[PDB]
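Task: sequence in, structure out. Protein: LIP1, secretory lipase (Family 3).
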Amino acid sequence: CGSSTDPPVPNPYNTKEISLAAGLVQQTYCDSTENGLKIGDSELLYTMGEGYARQRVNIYHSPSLGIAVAIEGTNLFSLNSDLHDAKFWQEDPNERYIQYYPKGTKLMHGFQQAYNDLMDDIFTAVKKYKKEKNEKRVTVIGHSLGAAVALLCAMDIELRMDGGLYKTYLFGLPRLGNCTFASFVDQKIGDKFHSIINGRDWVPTVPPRALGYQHPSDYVWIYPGNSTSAKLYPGQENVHGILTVAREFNNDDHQGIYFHTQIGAVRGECPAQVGAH
Ligand SMILES: *[C@@H]1O[C@H](CO)[C@@H](O[C@@H]2O[C@H](CO)[C@@H](O)[C@H](O)[C@H]2NC(C)=O)[C@H](O)[C@H]1NC(C)=O
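Result:
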């Protein structure tokens, strides 16, 4: 697999949508049982899971994003653990959807397993609220471990759900699949894929490329962290991007401010506060 040498370009992404999506996923770190909670322009419709065993998933309706699915990213397992452990092994796509993927696709076991525990509930709830809200757009959002799950979900929606995917917004995204997977993401949802990295965050560097993992094309890197200075680094694994500035192995920037919305996670803002910073 290659590494892009394209020079960085200005950030072209909608920063109001990023700010909104950041709040929608921060809220999944919070108790989300309140009827009709409003986050930004969006209304909370449904919540699944909790934090242990399975990631919390919130479903919203948004005038700008449509039916928005947001996936919590708590430490079900740790990404700073022994990399020989089975969590990090590459494996085939699950039988539910393997027929849609090109030969040779591989995914990280720990992330695929987490998505597989959620996918049938997500599909059932999304279809229900698309019908009830007369909404064709589906947006998938995730942070941290949840961003890798959300990337798999976004592909699953594009491949298997009638109407496909509208957009995906991914914060502090770990690597998820191999070279073949990464290029299939570009092919299927490249124009819909938004990966946002804050500051010195280390999570987008794991699992390592030495284990066969590869990011899809493009990310927007906020630097310095929590600022509004950001550029787009085109192509897969752009050599001019985050490794030019030493990563910090704590969660500070990872749980930082993304275009005025904090994703502080379990010790963040509950309820989430779109645009408050
Ligand atoms: C960006 O903002 C985040 C908060 O969203 C900062 O994270 C905090 O960092 C301090 C250490 O300086 C920790 O004690 C806090 O626990 C962190 N908060 C959270 C929610 O994790 C981060 O330091 C900021 N980064 C920069 C470069 O200013």
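Residues 93 and 99 are 9 Å apart (CA to CA).
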